[PDB]
Amino acid sequence: VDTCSLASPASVCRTKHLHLRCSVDFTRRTLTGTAALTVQSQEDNLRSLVLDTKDLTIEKVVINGQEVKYALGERQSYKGSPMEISLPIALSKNQEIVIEISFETSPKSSALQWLTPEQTSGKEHPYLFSQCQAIHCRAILPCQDTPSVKLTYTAEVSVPKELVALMSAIRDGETPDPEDPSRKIYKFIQKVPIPCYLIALVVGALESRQIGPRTLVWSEKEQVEKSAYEFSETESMLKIAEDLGGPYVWGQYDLLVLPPSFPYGGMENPCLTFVTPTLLAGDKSLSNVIAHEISHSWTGNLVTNKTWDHFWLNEGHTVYLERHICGRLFGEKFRHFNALGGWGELQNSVKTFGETHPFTKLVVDLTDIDPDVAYSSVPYEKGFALLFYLEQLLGGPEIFLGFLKAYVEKFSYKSITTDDWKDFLYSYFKDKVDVLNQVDWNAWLYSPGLPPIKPNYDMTLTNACIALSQRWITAKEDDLNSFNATDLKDLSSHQLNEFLAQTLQRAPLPLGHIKRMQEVYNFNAINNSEIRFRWLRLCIQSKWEDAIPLALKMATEQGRMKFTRPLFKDLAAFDKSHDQAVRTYQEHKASMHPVTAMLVGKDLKVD
Ligand SMILES: Nc1nc(-c2ccc(Cc3ccccc3)cc2)cs1
Ligand SMILES: [Yb+3]
Numbered sequence: 001v002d003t004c005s006l007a008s009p010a011s012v013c014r015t016k017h018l019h020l021r022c023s024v025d026f027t028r029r030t031l032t033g034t035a036a037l038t039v040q041s042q043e044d045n046l047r048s049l050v051l052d053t054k055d056l057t058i059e060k061v062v063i064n065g066q067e068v069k070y071a072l073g074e075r076q077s078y079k080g081s082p083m084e085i086s087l088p089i090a091l092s093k094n095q096e097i098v099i100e101i102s103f104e105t106s107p108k109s110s111a112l113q114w115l116t117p118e119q120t121s122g123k124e125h126p127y128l129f130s131q132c133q134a135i136h137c138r139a140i141l142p143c144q145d146t147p148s149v150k151l152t153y154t155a156e157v158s159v160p161k162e163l164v165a166l167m168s169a170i171r172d173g174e175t176p177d178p179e180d181p182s183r184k185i186y187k188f189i190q191k192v193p194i195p196c197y198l199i200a201l202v203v204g205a206l207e208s209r210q211i212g213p214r215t216l217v218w219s220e221k222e223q224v225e226k227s228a229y230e231f232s233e234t235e236s237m238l239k240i241a242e243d244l245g246g247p248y249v250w251g252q253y254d255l256l257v258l259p260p261s262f263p264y265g266g267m268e269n270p271c272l273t274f275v276t277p278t279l280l281a282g283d284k285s286l287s288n289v290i291a292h293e294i295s296h297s298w299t300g301n302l303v304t305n306k307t308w309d310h311f312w313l314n315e316g317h318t319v320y321l322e323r324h325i326c327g328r329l330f331g332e333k334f335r336h337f338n339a340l341g342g343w344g345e346l347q348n349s350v351k352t353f354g355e356t357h358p359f360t361k362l363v364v365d366l367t368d369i370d371p372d373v374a375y376s377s378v379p380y381e382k383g384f385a386l387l388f389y390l391e392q393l394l395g396g397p398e399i400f401l402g403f404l405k406a407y408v409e410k411f412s413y414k415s416i417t418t419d420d421w422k423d424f425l426y427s428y429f430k431d432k433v434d435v436l437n438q439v440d441w442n443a444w445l446y447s448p449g450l451p452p453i454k455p456n457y458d459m460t461l462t463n464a465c466i467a468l469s470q471r472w473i474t475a476k477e478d479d480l481n482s483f484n485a486t487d488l489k490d491l492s493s494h495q496l497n498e499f500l501a502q503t504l505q506r507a508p509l510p511l512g513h514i515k516r517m518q519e520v521y522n523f524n525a526i527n528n529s530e531i532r533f534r535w536l537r538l539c540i541q542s543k544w545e546d547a548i549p550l551a552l553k554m555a556t557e558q559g560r561m562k563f564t565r566p567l568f569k570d571l572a573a574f575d576k577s578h579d580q581a582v583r584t585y586q587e588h589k590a591s592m593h594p595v596t597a598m599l600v601g602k603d604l605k606v607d
């Protein structure tokens with residue numbers, strides 16, 4: 001059972017299909033409509049079932065053309081309110097019925113951000129976007145909000161006719177709304193079964209540009225040109241991914257570049273990956289995020305975690321595939337550079353949380369934990385480290401890629417646990433069971449901290465970054481004149497970021513050093529978000545007041561949690577900026593994404 005859901009479990013019943021008809025009302029910040037669930041019993045004599053909801057208003061439930069009884073339970077904090085529905089006839093095993101729920105969302109839906117015109121690029125039209133992962137689909141529509149259940153869906157969405165709707169589905173046309181001449185209906189079909197967390201909706205003044213044979217990029221007009229160039233490697237990456245995972249089953253692979261408040265780097269919504277506009281570096285250098293989202297089309301979207309306790313299955317295997325895509329494009333030594341950088345990020349996470357912190361375990365027990373509070377890079381990097389260790393133990397990357405492809409084929413269209421995965425690993429590698437039995441499984445899967453063994457990493461591309469960082473760290477005042485813009489001449493953007501990450505791991509540095517760094521390298525001019533982020537953190541943690549306005553601007557003019565959360569934490573920890581940071585958060589809170597607003601507030605102990 002999934003401890004994060006209040007619905008009937010998949011052993012009682014399973015939703016097979018959703019037909020969603022809804023209208024997006026910007027004046028009331030609500031979605032209103034009907035969710036028709038086709039539900040298949042998995043037990044004899046099924047007479048009622050329970051769905052997840054959060055802040056939903058229910059108008060009626062109709063089964064076989066008649067209204068039926070239902071009841072909402074007491075709220076269970078972030079889990080929401082269970083909804084019990086009484087069936088009009090009892091179902092046998094495998095019998096199906098269609099349940100049509102009439103509902104309305106709350107303006108405070110934790111799934112949604114509603115933007116006024118002034119919060120958009122274009123300034124003339126409002127905007128809406130969803131983010132359902134992990135357990136926010138229940139704040140859009142009543143459902144079994146667990147990744148253990150997979151369903152196809154169709155949808156018809158009425159919007160103001162000047163705007164465009166897109167969903168995590170194949171576009172299936174548009175028509176005027178026959179009931180309202182100010183509106184247009186956009187239609188969608190998702191024929192591949194998905195977990196409900198992959199349901200997505202955006203409505204705004206969106207334009208599209210074709211960038212490959214099965215890819216459009218979508219954004220407000222102002223960002224289309226830049227996005228189309230930034231993501232032009234998309235089709236090449238899809239072809240690599242198909243070689244590694246097997247056929248891409250989803251038809252279209254579109255990209256939507258969201259407003260700056262999108263909380264994540266990307267989200268793997270099927271047929272319509274969502275990405276942060278913080279990726280628009282100008283040089284394609286943050287394209288690993290696109291590789292990552294592409295990879296989810298196999299690991300996550302085809303083979304899915306059964307509950308959120310096993311999230312590392314989704315992320316670790318995706319990061320493993322991502323790094324192979326970027327290794328195929330730019331070489332194996334680049335794969336190792338990225339892998340090593342990930343170990344660094346894991347070190348950072350373990351130091352921040354503490355080496356005994358339960359959120360440093362690979363398998364977590366989220367029973368009474370808001371999944372959004374648990375989120376971190378641990379499942380990503382500890383998960384990747386496990387897989388990279390296994391690759392190295394079991395004969396190298398070609399061998400382990402064989403396992404990955406077999407794993408995806410085995411569990412396609414299924415939801416699985418860590419034990420499912422481990423059993424399949426032992427089956428696939430049964431001729432190497434003696435090797436597998438050297439792994440300290442309990443440590444790797446269930447213990448906090450750094451993993452018990454560190455993989456081997458090629459250092460070729462890292463050495464220049466380490467050498468320059470060590471020069472700065474060991475420099476005294478009288479050595480500062482020795483640094484020059486020529487120090488950077490043979491570093492890629494990726495190496496510049498790694499130099500800053502290496503250096504930030506040793507922060508603070510003396511204030512004079514940081515001042516000299518800006519004087520010779522002019523890092524303040526760099527627009528790349530990753531580089532800028534680490535540079536500003538370095539400056540704040542080294543107590544440079546000149547960086548306060550820069551860091552406050554970055555923290556509030558975008559909302560990617562990876563950047564915003566630590567920028568706010570560093571600004572709150574610097575006495576010179578503490579007041580301004582708390583004030584700035586409180587003033588921006590109403591305009592923030594609800595989840596990022598919640599988490600910043602927790603971090604700051606404010607509000
Ligand atoms: N240290 C570990 N943390 C996790 C974990 C982290 C977060 C979630 C849920 C989640 C998943 C994706 C976006 C928001 C919330 C599930 C599991 C898994 S292992
Ligand atoms: Yb029966």
Ligand SMILES: [Yb+3]
Pocket residue numbers: 172
């Ligand atoms: Yb069609």
Ligand SMILES: [Yb+3]
Pocket residue numbers: 419420423
């Ligand atoms: Yb087992």
Ligand SMILES: [Yb+3]
Pocket residue numbers: 476478479
């Ligand atoms: Yb000296």
Ligand SMILES: [Zn+2]
Pocket residue numbers: 292296314315318
């Ligand atoms: Zn991911």
